[PDB]
Design a protein around this ligand. Sequence first.
Ligand SMILES: *[C@@H]1O[C@H](CO)[C@@H](O[C@@H]2O[C@H](CO)[C@@H](O[C@@H]3O[C@H](CO[C@H]4O[C@H](CO)[C@@H](O)[C@H](O[C@H]5O[C@H](CO)[C@@H](O)[C@H](O)[C@@H]5O[C@H]5O[C@H](CO)[C@@H](O)[C@H](O)[C@@H]5O)[C@@H]4O)[C@@H](O)[C@H](O[C@H]4O[C@H](CO)[C@@H](O)[C@H](O)[C@@H]4O[C@H]4O[C@H](CO)[C@@H](O)[C@H](O)[C@@H]4O)[C@@H]3O)[C@H](O)[C@H]2NC(C)=O)[C@H](O)[C@H]1NC(C)=O
Ligand SMILES: O=C(c1cnc(N[C@H]2Cc3cc(Cl)cc(Cl)c3C2)nc1)N1CCC12COC2
Ligand SMILES: [Ca+2]
Ligand SMILES: [Ca+2]
Ligand SMILES: [K+]
Ligand code: NA
Ligand SMILES: [Zn+2]
Length: 799
Amino acid sequence: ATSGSCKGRCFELQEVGPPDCRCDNLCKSYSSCCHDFDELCLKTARGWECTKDRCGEVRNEENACHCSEDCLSRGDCCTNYQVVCKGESHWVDDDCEEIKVPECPAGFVRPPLIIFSVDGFRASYMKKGSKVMPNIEKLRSCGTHAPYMRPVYPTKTFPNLYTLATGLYPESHGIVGNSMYDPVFDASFHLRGREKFNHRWWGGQPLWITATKQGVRAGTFFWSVSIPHERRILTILQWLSLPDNERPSVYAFYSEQPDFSGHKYGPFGPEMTNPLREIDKTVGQLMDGLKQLRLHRCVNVIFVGDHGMEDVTCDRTEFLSNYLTNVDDITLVPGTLGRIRAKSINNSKYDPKTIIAALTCKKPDQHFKPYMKQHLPKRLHYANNRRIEDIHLLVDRRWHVARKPLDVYKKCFFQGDHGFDNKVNSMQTVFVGYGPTFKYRTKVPPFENIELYNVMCDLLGLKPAPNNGTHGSLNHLLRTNTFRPTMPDEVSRPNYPGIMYLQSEFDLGCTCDDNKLEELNKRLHTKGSTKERHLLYGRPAVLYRTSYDILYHTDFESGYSEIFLMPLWTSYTISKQAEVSSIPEHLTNCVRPDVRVSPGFSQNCLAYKNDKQMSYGFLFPPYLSSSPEAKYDAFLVTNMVPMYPAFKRVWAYFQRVLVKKYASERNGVNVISGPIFDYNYDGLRDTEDEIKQYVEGSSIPVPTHYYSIITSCLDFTQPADKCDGPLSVSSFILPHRPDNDESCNSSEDESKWVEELMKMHTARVRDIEHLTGLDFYRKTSRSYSEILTLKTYLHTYES
Ligand SMILES: *[C@@H]1O[C@H](CO)[C@@H](O[C@@H]2O[C@H](CO)[C@@H](O[C@@H]3O[C@H](CO[C@H]4O[C@H](CO)[C@@H](O)[C@H](O[C@H]5O[C@H](CO)[C@@H](O)[C@H](O)[C@@H]5O[C@H]5O[C@H](CO)[C@@H](O)[C@H](O)[C@@H]5O)[C@@H]4O)[C@@H](O)[C@H](O[C@H]4O[C@H](CO)[C@@H](O)[C@H](O)[C@@H]4O[C@H]4O[C@H](CO)[C@@H](O)[C@H](O)[C@@H]4O)[C@@H]3O)[C@H](O)[C@H]2NC(C)=O)[C@H](O)[C@H]1NC(C)=O
Ligand SMILES: O=C(c1cnc(N[C@H]2Cc3cc(Cl)cc(Cl)c3C2)nc1)N1CCC12COC2
Ligand SMILES: [Ca+2]
Ligand SMILES: [Ca+2]
Ligand SMILES: [K+]
Ligand code: NA
Ligand SMILES: [Zn+2]
């Protein structure tokens, strides 16, 4: 009913209720603007720049922007007014000067935040395009910057923007791709069209809602595509001239570039220079505009991207029609990832298992890998949403997957795309923070975009909604407004059992072929005399209610669960000088009762014998025993964990070859290893009643994954066990699978495939925390914020 008027309502902040016509920055996208929105709100006359001949003009309200004497008080000068007309310098030409305190006009309650978001802005543009982005380069060198910022998977636009807004993984906020089917709604979300505007898609609590609920006003973050960038900037600057009670504190600008051009020309196409220059000019308009309003040393500015851009061409397409015969029985969500479901829920013939097998290791250079979603690397956090299809294809960088060839030429055109694994270098994007609350001329390590919501909340004095950030992990970006987290309280205290059972009380079906001076010696070991060597950062805290025992040994310490009948964690240190040994022949099948732990709270060997699929391994490796006599400890029933034979090939190579390799490279390592149970693929520790698989005929639960946390000194001139300073960590969460179908070269020696598997399943310590309910690094000499940053670190193994 577009017969209302936008008079005095241009870019109004409260969108008004149909069937009244709209005047807000999204009205165009809903074809809902008042009849006079273009005439009143999208003025273009005379362009965007003051010229010497306009200086002091008589106000003409038709002009896009003003060069009249009254313009600063009206808040609608062209951004270069003071430069052209009052002998001022452009912001970019001014020296960098530290902003120690906010320098704001009277009536400003808090420094505003402006988020300048750029689509497709790959991390390496900051160096490669530096010659043509002076304004961006100044923000970067004068403020706080990371070398790169890691997006979420899939590295598509809307999943990443909404992660920036919420602090949530896509599985949690519900925007899991740029297209989706929700079976509960029976409804589809797409880029083109109207369903995507329905609020039921968008979960969690985005920043503008967090602000509004807590009494902080927000500019609307979404801009209709036809609103020119110059008008977006002028609109933000006009909002910043509103009266105190009406003026927002948080704003977002968005640019569709350089993504738009990158899809057409590739990430480094010669055509990409111009888009980067134009974005830089837009940054210059904002900063000049702020300087005119005396806000350039008041506002915090974030310059942030959603994802990068890779070289991708029509010819690098894999076709499912080359693998499946049944291609017409499937629906594929295609491109830089694949998602497969049945075309018809009425076809009881459709079988996921046969589709996976037809797609598994079928061609020698296959450029995609199929996964059941629960088997994807846990670091992707891409499974716990009904909108994510059970079958997933992880597509190699530089490739696409499509159903049939005709999908690719009845839809070559494009040279860039994005969407791949969020570890891929080409997908990485940018972060710069500039302002009073950010640090001065500071470089920070790369971090994940899920962390920024918390920081944006800190910048605005908001309490964040519950999210997947680790609040405090990015305190090192900030001068002020830091978040002083406290360590979580331990919920369960350990028991410390001594010797309480005789050997003959155990009827576990286990067998094992097994002085006065050093009788005392091994008593001391069982009492924890070496514990300072093997437990370097304190005992992990158990953050849930359970029954567990601390068990000391010469070579390792463990926290042994009476409920799960195995360790929650096993901690050991391997020095650079440590020697690897074999398992002696007489000890091959040795398993020994632990006289500290009751038979009723022990595993038993007969279950493993009876279970024809399931074998066992050990958490502390027998290969790394300090002495023949200490080795006996490694065969305790309390150190045993269930392992499929296929997995034991992985585990044995880790333990026998790789731990020593890491100790020699890193100058000793401390290893914490353990099981993980995540049968409902939610990324969170399972309770006992969630476990779907036990060792046959027993109560021994089968892990879904095995973790290790491998810590050393960041200054590798110091040994892991005498480190005075910051730590270095790498971790993994390996899937506990009955086959090695994930690894196409698994018929070869482990030296050819195991380490590449482990790299794909790299993890953060925080990922393991979620999955175990344990809290690590509780007793270090480091600040808690520093430890939070360490727990969020991901070792990516990119070149
Ligand atoms: C990343 O950070 C996020 C945020 O902190 C973490 O997610 C939280 O995890 C908690 C545990 O999984 C979860 O708590 C549950 O929430 C239920 C209430 O849910 C609604 O209310 C909140 C508050 O406003 C809201 O945010 C929720 O939003 C979800 O759902 C809507 C769709 O309806 C979406 O729009 C939105 O995108 C979001 O979806 C995501 O989460 C849901 C689960 O809530 C998933 O199913 C989706 O796939 C998607 O990931 C909701 O609108 C509450 O009812 C639960 O309480 C039950 O659960 C346990 C027992 O299981 C018990 O304590 C209770 O007694 C109760 O049991 C009864 O219900 C059971 C389940 O039906 C039933 O089986 C029993 O038999 C009983 O009847 C529970 O508290 C919290 O909602 C989410 N929040 C978000 C935003 O996702 C996430 O874990 C972090 N990730 C990692 C890896 O760390
Ligand atoms: O595509 C976009 C679009 C527009 N405006 C924006 N603005 C960004 C700025 C920002 C910053 C953060 Cl921190 C977080 C979020 Cl969610 C956002 C949204 N994004 C996309 N438009 C809206 C109409 C269409 C064309 O297809 C849909
Ligand atoms: Ca994008
Ligand atoms: Ca779980
Ligand atoms: K067996
Ligand atoms: Na294989
Ligand atoms: Zn794109």
